[PDB]
Ligand SMILES: *[C@@H]1O[C@H](CO)[C@@H](O[C@@H]2O[C@H](CO)[C@@H](O[C@@H]3O[C@H](CO)[C@@H](O)[C@H](O[C@H]4O[C@H](CO)[C@@H](O)[C@H](O)[C@@H]4O[C@H]4O[C@H](CO)[C@@H](O)[C@H](O)[C@@H]4O[C@H]4O[C@H](CO)[C@@H](O)[C@H](O)[C@@H]4O)[C@@H]3O)[C@H](O)[C@H]2NC(C)=O)[C@H](O)[C@H]1NC(C)=O
């Protein structure tokens with residue numbers, strides 16, 4: 143009987159229910175520790191380091207850690223015991239040798255994984271190097287690292303740590319902010335409350351559960367703040383010393399630093415050296431501890447942060463009161479993002495249209511931009527959750543938004559209480575964070591491309607021999623981080639087979655595949671009816687259900703020439719004899735719809751000859767477009783495509799529509815389409831994409847590329863105005879490219895939104911293609 147006291151139970155791995163008291167390392171957070179928890183489990187006497195005089199001491203149970211002969215056996219030596227008492231070196235003082243196979247004690251069933259999470263560790267802190275952080279720098283230089291890892295939006299703690307744990311976007315896992323209101327629960331989630339403890343908020347399947355469910359024992363992934371870091375490390379090491387039947391295989395450590403200091407001093411403060419040195423010392427204690435247990439060439443260690451840190455002060459704050467008549471009616475989640483809702487839930491007089499109008503381009507320098515959530519860049523994946531308010535403000539890096547001037551407080555001396563913050567758009571350089579992987583399963587001395595934190599969950603599953611729960615990572619895209627345990631991915635099977643049709647109120651006046659379709663036809667991964675259409679200058683997959691191409695593919699060489707639309711063809715639209723009238727668009731609809739016009743997927747401007755230009759005016763190359771959006775699209779097609787062709791030694795372009803009316807990041811079924819061109823069956827796209835591919839070695843032309851590929855893509859929102867672009871009264875050269883850059887995307891994003899699978903026929907491995915598909919060109 144072990145109830146009522148923590149004798150024999152300190153940091154017990156199996157939690158205990160009421161009315162017994164607890165002795166695990168969250169009992170402090172639940173106010174449930176036994177009366178003697180501090181006395182027995184949180185010993186501090188004599189500190190955390192052996193000194194020479196303690197070597198061979200008689201064991202004194204009051205000590206924090208031990209330097210007696212029995213400590214290696216008991217598993218509770220101070221982490222420096224063997225250095226001070228047994229003539230050995232610190233882990234950091236050794237050179238690294240490649241670990242080709244795990245070197246674990248007999249009886250280990252798999253290499254353990256330890257995740258070392260650091261809060262607010264900006265990628266660029268790594269530049270301080272070994273002067274400041276020798277242990278971390280050793281892991282980085284000796285193991286596998288990326289120059290940075292991209293967090294999820296919002297670039298805050300709870301959404302990112304839970305994304306690390308689940309492989310899910312915040313909209314999917316449900317932790318969409320550090321604070322949240324759920325209108326179904328009618329409850330608020332916050333750091334400073336009990337609501338956060340209720341399982342109802344927390345979706346997906348976090349790693350500790352995936353592990354447990356598949357027979358891989360987990361240590362705690364949460365530490366009460368009153369447990370000192372030294373004790374967290376000593377507890378992990380004690381658990382690792384347990385017998386085979388009880389020892390966990392996966393562990394996490396969390397440090398609140400360097401976030402706290404970054405907020406107080408700014409990311410460039412000289413004060414920042416101190417928390418970085420302290421974190422490094424803690425890393426050193428872990429590695430020394432592993433080394434003295436002979437587990438330093440056994441364990442896989444991940445060093446990872448949740449987000450970075452930006453320079454932000456009191457003085458750089460925009461106030462809603464300067465824009466809006468009645469800020470009393472609303473609640474604002476403020477700071478480095480904005481979410482607005484009515485102060486009274488359901489208030490029927492809440493009108494987010496008029497609020498957004500009053501926030502749109504009101505001052506020339508304005509340091510935030512309002513969006514209905516469905517209009518945010520699709521790369522953010524920040525809309526499909528009832529806890530995300532309809533009205534969102536994207537805040538400029540280095541700025542805050544608040545409701546009114548008095549929400550900001552500065553001391554009478556002029557001093558602000560903070561100089562750093564985070565939360566901004568996840569492509570912002572300052573928000574990027576760190577990734578290092580070190581151990582037998584990670585590669586040796588390998589630098590990999592920057593990747594997104596949604597991908598890590600699959601990799602952590604791989605490292606532990608687990609089947610991942612369904613998530614938003616792309617399994618195989620990070621196989622190049624690993625020496626072994628790689629996941630062997632499979633091409634998704636094509637669901638619908640194309641038809642290849644021959645010749646069967648609008649007026650006017652082969653070897654295409656080889657040149658224009660460079661990576662094979664995209665596969666359609668849902669049940670539908672569509673036709674492949676060849677032309678001199680382009681190829682398309684034409685949908686009989688949506689009456690427009692799902693994709694249009696074409697190649698523009700570096701020397702290709704732009705021409706104009708002859709002014710005698712300005713309104714030219716030609717019937718397509720390959721496609722019957724019932725499955726075609728018509729111009730009556732566009733004439734009759736006074737708000738809707740049309741554009742073309744393959745641009746007439748890039749036609750190879752006058753004769754070939756006629757194909758560009760086919761009804762099957764036409765798509766519906768608001769006049770405002772044509773300003774953007776025509777500029778992309780007339781100007782930007784050749785600029786890209788010129789700079790990249792030609793480009794292959796695949797363009798097409800996206801329909802995402804319910805804003806879930808997935809291709810809409812027919813039923814979900816909410817808008818049609820007036821009096822017609824012609825669906826109106828929510829977005830238009832383009833995927834622009836060339837040869838990474840740009841001395842080779844795009845169509846004659848022997849090695850890895852280079853890609854950039856976007857997903858442009860199909861809006862009936864250009865209110866998003868404050869300078870849109872000006873010529874397109876002054877704003878359209880900035881718009882496009884904001885709506886940059888991964889090929890994978892387009893795949894979800896279209897039900898298409900690209901790059902199926904290349905000379906590259908499928909794992910490398912998956913990496914390519916997950917790439918995001920950030921323009922930073
Ligand atoms: C990205 O990847 C995903 C994964 O493949 C893609 O699919 C989407 O994944 C979503 C996440 O699972 C999924 O949402 C879920 O939808 C179902 C049905 O509508 C819904 O019931 C789920 O609801 C919960 O989870 C949310 C947060 O995720 C919670 O806020 C909510 O309260 C529910 O919570 C509970 O169930 C969870 C497990 O699902 C538990 O983890 C959680 O603790 C809680 O369980 C308890 O509380 C209960 C209530 O008291 C109690 O009964 C129970 O016993 C426990 O104590 C969730 O919203 C989408 O449906 C899914 N979409 C599709 C088409 O499959 C997504 O598409 C990918 N995105 C892209 C762009 O590709």
Ligand SMILES: *[C@@H]1O[C@H](CO)[C@@H](O[C@@H]2O[C@H](CO)[C@@H](O)[C@H](O)[C@H]2NC(C)=O)[C@H](O)[C@H]1NC(C)=O
Pocket residue numbers: 143144145146161162163
């Ligand atoms: C095991 O020990 C626990 C802890 O003391 C016992 O539970 C206590 O029972 C007494 C009654 O004899 C109560 O006054 C205490 O409040 C209980 N404490 C707790 C934490 O529950 C329990 O009865 C013991 N069981 C056996 C079989 O010996």
Ligand SMILES: *[B]([O])([O])C1=[C][C]=[C][C]=C1O[C]C1=[C]C(Cl)=[C][C]=[C]1
Pocket residue numbers: 261262298299300320333398401402405
């Ligand atoms: B994250 O958004 O930085 C975050 C969220 C909730 C609680 C803590 C946290 O960061 C770690 C931390 C920051 C401070 Cl200022 C103090 C202590 C811990």
Ligand SMILES: *[C@@H]1O[C@H](CO)[C@@H](O)[C@H](O)[C@H]1NC(C)=O
Pocket residue numbers: 465466467468496497500
């Ligand atoms: C928007 O601005 C106009 C004044 O130009 C005003 O009539 C209206 O109250 C404002 N609405 C809100 C919600 O701020």
Ligand SMILES: [Ca+2]
Pocket residue numbers: 801802803804805806807808809810811814
């Ligand atoms: Ca959808």
Ligand SMILES: [Zn+2]
Pocket residue numbers: 261262298299300401448449
């Ligand atoms: Zn954080």
Ligand SMILES: [Zn+2]
Pocket residue numbers: 262299401405564
């Ligand atoms: Zn923070």
